[PDB]
Design a protein around this nucleic acid. Sequence first.
RNA 1: AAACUUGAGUGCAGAAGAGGAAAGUGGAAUUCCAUGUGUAGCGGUGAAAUGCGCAGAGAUAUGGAGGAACACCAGUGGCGAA
Length: 112
Amino acid sequence: NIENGVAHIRSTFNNTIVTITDEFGNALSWSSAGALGFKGSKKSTPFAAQMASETASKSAMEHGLKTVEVTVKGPGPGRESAIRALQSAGLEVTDVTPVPHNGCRPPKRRRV
RNA sequence: AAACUUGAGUGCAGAAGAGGAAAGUGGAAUUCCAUGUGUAGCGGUGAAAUGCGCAGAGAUAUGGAGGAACACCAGUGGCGAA
Ligand SMILES: [Mg+2]
């Protein structure tokens, strides 16, 4: 039984991943678009992200979690959908996208 | 040959600068490593597959190693012969 928690959202252009934990960082339940049998372009849709945070939150509340914080990441479109649905699963809502200070060289641009 | 001070230098008084060389200090991020939680995919594309993963990945939290580069400031802004 844990009541205070943190919800991590990792939304990219290929997949949305949600991990729920306390403030101590130890996870309790996670889901993703792939865990719901979505493949490819389906795995990145904003609708398909909400089906993942809803699944994740229901498992964390089963442990007894009521208040969870939000840490969002990535430019994936499944950001509002995965965050609003956090408040839509009986969870009380009380940006961590890594930016470098000019560090490592990024890969070459794609000539599609 | 002799004068001159405008050109060109010097002196004096101010100011600005990513100009150069050397040695130090620091924060973010990437990768790898370890540890704790924790479970079924992660990753990737037009769509896929190769690839990694149940021997515990990816995610998350903490710590460590190492190299490289210096967000914001930042501007037909500045400096330099290039
Ligand atoms: Mg002077």
